[PDB]
Design a protein around this ligand. Structure first.
Ligand SMILES: [Zn+2]
Lengths: 173, 1023, 312, 154, 285
């Protein structure tokens, strides 16, 4: 049917090769129309493993991680370490809801093993160092959204939101 | 198009149902698609048709029925061949009206009216400007209904639309259908005001109240004045102007000093008097619309361009739009303050104006901000959503509904944070140092607060009591006696007023100044105050003690000939030579009865030393001592603001609650029974056998596009005739109709469209006029309107009947005429008219039996909360198709200093499903009225009220019907002085229980106990 | 560290015409704030530690020279911690279990979030199970006439508690949390008594987070007012902003000040902190540091019990 | 608190209403319902109860009718109006005492059979006369209302 | 500290009492008593302090300055007050008893509930700290009683059962220990549980319908009929008079407080409703 994938947005270079399909159908959940990014999904209760940044399953509700949603199943060499599920479009913490969904959606999430050997003394990290914000514009918003550099003349507007909208926690271990 | 949009509003002759399928064949005979000819004929002297693409999709994307009766049948009159002109209800589907032999006729009767415009429209000097459009947008209805012509429905197939509403929705959508070709940024603008009741309640003396409710409406009116000529009329979408005592006033003034002729206004002022105003005290003789009838919940539709004089800029300015509305609102407040300053200078020497002349210079930095904040959103549409590269795009029916959902969700997202307008002011510099301007007593402890606003630091302080005369001279206010008179007269000693409440008292002493912002870039900021100086139009305004004394007023009036003898040693039988014009119709129907109704009953027979006088005067002249209690009724509609979105909550209040629209699939079994029944009744003629085929095809055994792939039932038989349709593709009859109905019964609401909104708008306006005439038929006094609600004072005796007559009128079912709104059983019926009523949406009243000397702020805020919380906490048993369920809204709450009683009004959850339902609306109030008659006229002893305490627990504890019947019957018979009376509870009221949880108010649980509580409240209010 | 203030009887914190959610039986000339503004707790502590070394001062420099950083204030039943929650002229008291998952409610679907809001303020709101709003009428009597002394009739709405309730505030420098323990004081209002009882209950004191909860009114300098009241959606998500008077100084018997604030219990966004810090950077900033010193600008993490000031 | 007694009384009255066949017995029962409640609280419970049983004529057949009336619903206690109504009111009092556990039900249904224990029943009631004056007032007044309402005056 | 000394005391209603409040909730009463928060009668500290001040300003007219200082001034609020009463908490109401199965027959007993005892605890706890005369025995009685919360307990032995106020039957679980008499009334003291103690107390309040008669024709005047609610005789309230050391609070307790014992509280003094006796609980236990 119709499926999509979640993809973390870290500050570490675990971002290059995680996607396989760019359009899937004709549309993606994460829309960017003349105002900045929309439909940014947050995963609460789980932290990251930035070195190969993957979702560490915690129970702390203080821990949240953010990422964008696009269509596709990742790289066709996976699904024995990832989160494949199906929720009727009402049980997803999506920020900047612009449109509607058909009350059904198949999602993929990059998941990690807890690494049950250490105490998860986590810590959140913010998006700064526009140099990183610059060279991350290409790797995530070009191979995925071709409309950029054609309809988004306001790159400087969609730059600040990266540094103010997206954030997450990390183990730091 | 701009200044050519009349063909939009006029595309059809309102005798459109009479020329379809030859119902009148002689209309196209003696003349120099079939109906569009006379349409093209009647669009004369100005322009032909704009059918290339100006009106095409606008008519397509306003009717919301092209998707209902098929896109080709919607444009093939000769299908289902309906000679029968049935008028249908918009909200209902079964309420009908028959239309016969009352229609304009060709070339000898069609001219009896078309030139009567040109008796009053043409003669004025004008380069075909939009004032014609501003003098056609309203008086078209008037020249029609004055020509005793019956409003015809829109489509002989689906007649849930009056031709007038059809063409007005056309004109409305025309803005969008035009603008989204050049810049493609048409808009749906929504203006809203924050904390209306919170603001109104900030006053005293009932003058502050009236003018506060008038401010909240004018300051919003002034916003559209800068918008009803800037890009002309027809734009203000939901608050309609079809019956609007503010559009009228503005017009009749706009035909002065703009296009002023004399015989013209003679022709129309009397004409506009009948069908929009009805009040002998017109706009004139007050020079102000007497009723604040702007709700605040207003929305507008926008092209996306701006004209700077003979030249409009097709420029985006995407969001540099709503800030213009905000600066216009601020500029209206600035204009009102400037006018107050000018009027203080013109009144340079007069006490009450020697103060405003003083304060309006003591502080001006503070008053630069409005005393009421508005809340504005703006949703956007682009040509990519109307057309697919040239032509009408799919889902174009869905957008307007989706856009309105977007706007309402923007609003409900802004309700989550309330910003009191006082927060806008800057006070840290003043309140930290010795910087506050205090007149009178400068409080040595920094400052004090207003005794009306309550929160802001007052600027004026009048002493409480030393001798109440000298201290005004001592502390730099009076300095003489000619002015301390007005001082003590307009603001009582011991008062503390902030700047804003001081302005309120000023305006309540000079209402005409509202014109300053009531016209709107139509006069000069000094022209109006000059007209005010050149007159002495005194205005009297009822107080609380005033309205607490209607009956004794009328008994002095009926005893006028034997009372003035015992009178005249206290100057009450005097006559005031001046012509005071109150906005209180009951005063206008009196005060020429040799009685100075312009007095303060608080002073004479509500005082502490003089009442002992008057009671003696009363004890020998057979008049009851006055009642120190008035009533304060306040209505409000259930889910009206959510009826505008199509949700079923107004049809089933309590059954289908609000929150049930997240996972409405849980409540599926009823939403079907509502919508599919509506539809199969929606649309008379032969289409009934058509919508019935597919109604359940959605999931019975047919999947998507699957009833359309199997059912050839009738469409193939409505075709194959002479020349009718030349496109053989018959799947289009159902290929998309199935999707239409699937959306409808999958999303659980009616597909919202501009026609829906303008129809409900005109309905709200008519309901206003009705309720206004109803309050005035009683001896009450209106304080507000707005469709959603109504606030008004009225004596304690005329409450119940009023309420009983209010709801029944609000549901379009009455017994007497309303000036000219000859009410029907579901329609309003102005002289040979039939406009649909609001028969399914409920209504809820709040009543406060308040002693006159009570703190108006508190009584108004309590009347507000006792309706808001009460609206969402009360529940009661309602018979859902026989079996009982629990309802939420549609009650009437009474309050007599704590003593409370909630009275339901429907007890039948789909409010109306039969012409006989109207009889049982608010019937419990008729029960109470009958019982009051039997108790007062002495057929049932008073002790029946108190003797209920013993039958309370028995009747409450009996779950059997006839047993409670016998119980209540002998409770009635025991205290039944005649002993063979037939006063009998309606036999359904046994068992109706009311649960009120999660709040500490004490409410009886059973209906029969609430009835006696209501009776006790009403009686004890009259003593 | 943490201070408990149990009211020994109904008690009133005067409020100017601010609370109208409650269906009042009769009127009353003065309502009572549900949670005492931090000016009141500040002054209540300052009353105990008052000497003649005071001298001149805008009632706060002299006040700040007596105490540590008071943090906030919230309710405390037996075990439970109730917290203020407001959505615009509509107050509520709820426990932590329902704060933890608000952001989703504040950003979810239309009708889902309407459901959530409704059941928050009506169903799970434990206010009316704690606070009863009893009204008291008072009069005076001239010993001569032995009747009511004319013009002397005041009506006040008190705050009556149905069960043992404390007020929880956190402070520092237990060098004063000794001279304060077990001391009954005239906690703000017309001569009402509450008992102080300090314990040792360590809590977090700094956290970064998307959404915060204002346990105490956040003060607006009014130089930001103009450029703040236009974009509330950037800063506040749910609550109420309006002018409040700080209080009434006992030093020189005057109303203290007035400035727009975000009332106790209000969901603000993390865009608040940068705004306030990067709006006032001068004598204003020192003034507002004096303010926050007595528990004014306070947030609380919606996830776990952790506080933070704004300008520090 | 005695706010369930407005339902208990309803049940007992429904029973004794469907139990009396001759309408004259119903009107006589109404008379008793009005008369006895004053005496119970003026003259004491024990004197009024002695009066009631003395006018009730506790014979084993009418006693069996009452026993079934406790459990059945069609039970027909018959005889004479002025004598079956007193038994009906005694049934009212006993229905109360059973359903409020003031006296144990099995003990009652047993002592209404064995003549010897029928006297120990009266003894028990003597040991519960103060308790059965406070509890039963509301119940008996409800029966009074129901009697005046549902049984048409003679 | 600014609260150096406390002073708990009982308020024994010699006659009936009426400390009014405008018609507010009117469970068919037009002039109700002063409710607490739960529904129990209480005396606001405002009324209590005002009446006590008014009384002392006559029976000690020379010391008008000391009364002024300790209890606030009339027109000179240059200085606050140095004494302060807490809201008088209802402590024990009388109630008519028909005691089944008991030795020493009684016609009336006192009645309290665990709610009232908790409210009294709150006071005694919050006071013992500064109170150099720690009422450890009294507070120990009150927190021993509170151990049995949830049972209709009696502070005596020989009740075992009773019918209170001729409508409510209670099985009085006794005290498994011996407790000295809280007051010097040989009458027992029942501590009922709540929701049954609300009835026995709610029914022990004298509600009275009153009328006004036309002086000339021995007939009622129209509208001259209302109801009132009094607190019965022998009722006992509890309160504390706080204080901050002032060197005239010393004399205010040395001369004034230990001297006075009878005071007129509440309204309707002409109907003789309000003579009340003040017993300081520091000389008794
Ligand atoms: Zn004011």
């Amino acid at each position: 049917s119709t499926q999509r994938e979640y993809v973390f947005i870290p500050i570490t270079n675990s971002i290059t090769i995680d996607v396989k399909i760019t359009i899937g159908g004709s549309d993606h959940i994460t829309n960017i129309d003349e105002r900045g990014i929309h439909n940014v999904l947050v995963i609460t209760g789980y932290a990251v493993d930035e070195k190969n940044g993957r979702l560490v399953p915690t129970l702390d509700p203080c821990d949240y991680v953010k990422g964008i949603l696009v269509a596709g199943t990742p790289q066709q060499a996976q699904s024995n370490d990832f989160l494949t599920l199906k929720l009727p479009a009402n049980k997803l913490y999506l920020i900047r809801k612009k449109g509607n969904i058909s009350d059904d959606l198949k999602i993929y999430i990059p998941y990690s093993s807890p690494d049950a050997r250490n105490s998860m003394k986590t810590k959140p990290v913010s998006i700064s160092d526009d140099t990183i914000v610059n060279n991350i514009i290409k790797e995530v918003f070009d191979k995925i959204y071709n409309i950029t550099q054609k309809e988004k003349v306001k790159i400087e507007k969609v730059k600040e939101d990266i540094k103010e909208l997206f954030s997450y926690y990390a183990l730091e271990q | 198009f701009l200044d050519y949009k009349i063909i939009a509003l006029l595309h059809d002759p309102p005798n459109k149902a009479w020329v379809i399928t030859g119902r009148a064949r002689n209309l196209t005979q003696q003349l120099s698609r079939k109906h569009e000819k006379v349409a093209k004929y009647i669009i004369n002297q100005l322009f032909g048709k704009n059918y290339s693409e100006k009106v095409d999709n606008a008519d397509k994307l306003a009717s919301s029925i092209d998707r209902y009766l098929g896109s080709i049948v919607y444009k093939e009159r000769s299908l289902f061949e309906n000679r029968s002109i049935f008028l249908k209800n918009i909200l209902l589907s079964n309420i009908q009206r028959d239309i016969g032999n009352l229609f304009p006729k060709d070339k000898s009767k069609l001219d009896n009216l078309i030139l009567e415009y040109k008796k009053l429209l043409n003669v004025i000097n004008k380069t075909n400007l939009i004032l014609k459009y501003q003098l056609f947008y309203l008086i078209y209805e008037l020249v029609w209904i004055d020509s005793k012509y019956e409003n015809t429905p829109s489509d002989t197939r689906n007649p849930t639309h009056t031709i007038f509403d059809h063409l007005y929705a056309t004109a409305a959508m025309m803005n969008w259908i035009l603008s989204l070709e050049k810049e493609a940024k048409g808009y749906l603008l929504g203006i809203d005001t924050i904390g209306v009741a919170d603001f109104i309640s900030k006053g005293r003396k009932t003058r502050d109240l009236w003018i506060s409710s008038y401010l909240v409406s004018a300051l919003l009116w002034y916003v559209i004045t800068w918008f009803i000529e800037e890009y002309g009329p027809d734009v203000i979408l939901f608050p309609s102007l079809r019956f609007n005592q503010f559009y009228a006033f503005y017009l009749l003034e706009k035909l002065r000093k703009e296009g002023v002729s004399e015989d013209v206004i003679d022709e129309i002022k009397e004409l506009i008097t009948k069908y929009i105003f009805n009040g002998d005290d017109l706009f004139e003789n007050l020079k102000i619309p007497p009723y604040p009838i702007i709700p605040g919940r207003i929305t507008l539709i926008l092209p996306g361009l701006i004209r700077e004089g003979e030249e409009y800029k097709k420029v985006q300015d995407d969001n540099c739009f709503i800030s213009k509305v905000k600066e216009r609102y601020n500029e209206g407040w600035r204009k009102l303050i400037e006018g107050l300053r000018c009027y203080s200078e013109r009144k340079r020497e007069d006490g009450f104006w020697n103060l405003v002349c003083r304060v309006l210079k003591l502080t001006e930095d503070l008053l630069q901000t409005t005393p009421l904040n508005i809340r504005v959103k703006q949703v956007s549409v682009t040509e990519d959503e109307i057309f697919n590269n040239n032509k009408l795009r799919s889902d174009s029916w869905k957008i307007y509904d989706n856009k309105y959902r977007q706007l309402v969700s923007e609003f409900k997202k802004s309700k989550l944070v309330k910003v009191t307008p006082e927060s806008r002011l800057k006070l840290f510099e003043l309140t930290k140092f010795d910087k506050l301007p205090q007149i009178g007593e400068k409080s040595k402890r920094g400052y004090e607060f207003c005794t009306s606003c309550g929160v802001l630091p007052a600027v004026v302080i009048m002493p409480k009591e030393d001798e109440l005369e000298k201290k005004l001279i001592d502390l730099g206010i009076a300095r003489d006696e000619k002015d301390v008179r007005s001082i003590k007269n307009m603001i009582s000693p011991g008062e503390r007023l902030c700047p804003w409440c001081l302005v309120k008292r000023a305006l309540g002493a000079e209402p005409r100044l509202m014109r300053i912002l009531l016209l709107g870039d139509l006069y000069s900021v000094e022209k109006i105050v000059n007209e005010i100086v050149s007159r002495d139009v005194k205005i009297e305004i009822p107080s609380t003690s005033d309205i607490a004394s209607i009956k004794t007023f009328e008994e002095m009036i009926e005893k006028k000939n034997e009372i003035c003898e015992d009178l005249k040693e206290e100057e009450v039988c005097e006559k005031p030579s001046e012509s005071v014009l109150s906005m209180w119709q009951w005063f206008n129907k009196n005060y020429y009865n040799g009685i100075n109704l312009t007095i303060d009953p608080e002073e004479y027979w509500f005082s502490e030393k003089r009442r002992r006088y008057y009671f003696s005067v009363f004890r020998r002249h057979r008049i009851t001592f006055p009642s120190p209690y008035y009533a304060l009724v306040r209505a409000d509609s259930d889910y009206l603001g959510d009826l505008l979105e199509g949700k079923l909550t107004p049809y089933l209040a309590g059954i289908i609650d609000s929150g049930d629209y997240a996972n409405i699939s849980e409540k599926k079994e009823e939403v079907n029974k509502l919508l599919e029944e509506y539809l199969v009744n929606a649309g008379s003629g032969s289409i009934v056998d058509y919508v019935k085929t597919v109604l359940k095809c959605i999931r019975e055994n047919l999947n998507k596009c699957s009833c359309a792939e199997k059912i050839y039932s009738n469409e193939v038989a409505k075709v194959m005739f002479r020349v009718n349709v030349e496109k053989a593709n018959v799947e289009e009859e159902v290929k998309n109709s199935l999707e239409y109905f699937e959306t409808i019964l999958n999303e659980g609401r009616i597909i919202v469209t501009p026609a829906w909104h303008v129809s409900i708008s005109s309905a709200l306006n008519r309901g206003l006029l009705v309720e206004l005439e109803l309050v005035n038929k009683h001896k009450g006094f209106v304080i507000y309107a707005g469709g959603d609600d109504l606030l008004a004072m009225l004596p304690v005796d005329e409450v119940l009947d009023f309420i009983k007559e209010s709801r029944r009128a609000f549901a379009g079912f009455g017994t007497e005429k309303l000036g000219n709104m000859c009410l029907e059983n579901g329609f309003v019926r102005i002289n040979n008219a039939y406009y649909p009523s609001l028969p399914i949406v409920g209504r809820s009243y709040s009543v406060i039996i308040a002693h006159y000397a009570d703190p108006l702020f508190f009584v108004i805020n309590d009347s507000y909360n006792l309706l808001e919380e009460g609206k969402e906490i009360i529940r009661y048993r309602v018979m859902y198709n026989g079996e009982y369920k629990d309802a939420k809204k549609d009650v009437a709450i009474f309050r007599y200093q704590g003593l409370t009683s909630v009275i339901p009004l429907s007890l039948k959850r789909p409010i109306v499903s039969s012409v006989s339902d109207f009889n049982e609306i608010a019937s419990i109030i008729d029960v109470i009225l009958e019982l009051k008659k039997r108790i007062d006229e002495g057929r049932i002893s008073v002790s029946l009220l108190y003797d209920y305490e013993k039958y309370k627990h028995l009747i409450v504890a009996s779950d059997e019907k006839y047993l409670t019947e016998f119980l209540v019957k002998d409770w009635i018979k025991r205290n039944s002085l005649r002993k063979h009376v037939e006063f009998t509870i309606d036999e359904k009221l046994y068992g109706v229980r009311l649960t009120i949880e999660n709040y500490p108010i004490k409410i009886p649980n059973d209906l029969i106990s609430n009835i006696v509580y209501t009776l006790r409240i009403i009686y004890g209010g009259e003593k | 560290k943490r201070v408990l203030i149990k009211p020994l009887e109904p008690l009133m914190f005067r409020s100017q015409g601010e609370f109208e959610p409650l269906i009042t039986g009769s009127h009353t000339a003065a309502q009572s704030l549900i949670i005492p503004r931090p000016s009141t707790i500040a002054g209540m502590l300052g009353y105990i530690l008052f000497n003649k070394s005071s001298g001149t001062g805008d009632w706060l420099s002299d006040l700040t020279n007596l105490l540590a950083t008071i943090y906030g204030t919230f309710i405390e039943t037996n075990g439970e911690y109730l917290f203020p929650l407001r959505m615009g002229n509509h107050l509520a008291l709820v426990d932590q279990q329902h704060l933890i998952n608000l952001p989703t409610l504040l950003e979810k679907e239309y009708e889902r979030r309407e459901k959530g809001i409704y059941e928050l303020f009506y169903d799970k709101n434990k206010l009316f199970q704690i606070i009863n709003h009893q009204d008291r009428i008072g009069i005076s009597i001239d010993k001569s006439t032995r009747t009511v002394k004319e013009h002397y009739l005041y009506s006040a709405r008190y705050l009556a508690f149905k069960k043992e309730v404390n007020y929880v505030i956190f402070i520092d420098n237990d060098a004063i949390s000794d001279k304060i323990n077990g001391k009954i004081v005239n906690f703000g209002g017309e001569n009402r008594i509450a008992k102080l009882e300090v314990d040792d209950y360590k809590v977090d004191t700094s956290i970064e987070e998307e959404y915060y909860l204002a346990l105490s009114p956040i003060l607006i300098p009014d130089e930001a007012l103009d450029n703040f009241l236009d974009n509330i959606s950037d800063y506040v998500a749910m609550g109420k902003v309006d002018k409040i008077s700080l209080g009434f100084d006992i030093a020189n018997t005057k109303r203290k000040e007035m400035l727009t604030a975000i009332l106790e219990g209000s969901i603000v966004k993390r865009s608040i902190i940068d705004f306030i810090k990067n709006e006032i950077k001068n004598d204003l900033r020192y003034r507002f540091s004096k303010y926050e010193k007595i528990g004014y600008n306070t947030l609380m993490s919606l996830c776990k019990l952790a506080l933070r000031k704004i300008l520090s | 608190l005695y706010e369930e007694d407005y339902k208990l009384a309803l049940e007992a009255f429904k029973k004794v209403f469907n139990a009396l066949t001759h309408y004259g017995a119903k009107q006589a029962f109404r008379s008793r319902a009005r008369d006895l409640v004053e005496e119970i609280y003026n003259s004491g419970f024990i004197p009024t109860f002695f009066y009631i049983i003395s006018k009730a004529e506790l014979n084993s057949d009418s006693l069996d009718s009452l026993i079934s009336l406790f459990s059945s619903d069609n039970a027909i206690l018959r005889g004479s109006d002025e004598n079956v109504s007193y038994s009906a009111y005694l049934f009212i009092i006993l229905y109360y005492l059973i359903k409020r556990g003031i006296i144990e039900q099995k003990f009652l249904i047993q002592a209404l059979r064995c003549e010897k224990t029928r006297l120990d029943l009266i003894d028990k009631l003597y040991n519960l006369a103060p308790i059965i004056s406070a509890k039963i007032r509301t119940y008996l007044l409800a029966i009074k209302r129901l009697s005046e309402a549902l049984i048409e005056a003679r | 500290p600014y609260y150096a000394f406390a002073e708990p005391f009982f308020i024994h209603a010699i006659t009936h009492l009426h400390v009014g409040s405008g018609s507010s909730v009117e469970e068919e009463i037009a002039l109700p008593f002063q409710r607490d928060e739960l529904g129990y009668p209480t005396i606001y500290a405002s009324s209590l302090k005002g009446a006590i001040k008014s009384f002392l300003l006559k029976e000690f007219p020379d010391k008008r300055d000391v009364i002024y200082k300790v209890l606030g001034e009339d027109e000179n609020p240059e200085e606050a007050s140095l004494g302060t009463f807490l809201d008088a908490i209802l402590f024990a109401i009388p109630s008519r008893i028909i005691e089944i199965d008991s030795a020493k027959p009684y016609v009336w007993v006192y009645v309290t509930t665990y709610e009232l005892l908790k409210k009294v605890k709150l006071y005694l706890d919050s006071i013992s700290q500064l109170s150099n005369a720690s009422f450890s025995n009294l507070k120990n009685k009150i927190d021993t009683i509170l151990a049995k919360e949830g049972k209709n307990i009696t502070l005596d032995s020989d009740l075992k059962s009773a019918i209170l106020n001729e409508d409510f039957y209670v099985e009085l679980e006794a005290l498994n220990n011996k407790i000295p008499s809280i007051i010097n009334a040989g009458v027992p003291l029942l501590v009922l549980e709540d929701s049954i103690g609300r009835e026995v107390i709610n029914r022990s309040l004298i509600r009275v319908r009153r009328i006004r008669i036309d002086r000339d024709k021995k007939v009622v005047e129209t509208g001259g009929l209302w109801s009132e609610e009094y607190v019965p005789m022998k009722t006992i309230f509890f309160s504390v008079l706080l204080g901050k050391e002032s060197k005239e609070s010393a004399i205010f307790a040395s001369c004034i407080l230990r001297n006075l014992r009878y005071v007129i509280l509440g309204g309707k003094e002409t109907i003789g409703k309000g003579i009340v006796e003040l017993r300081w609980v520091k000389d008794v236990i």
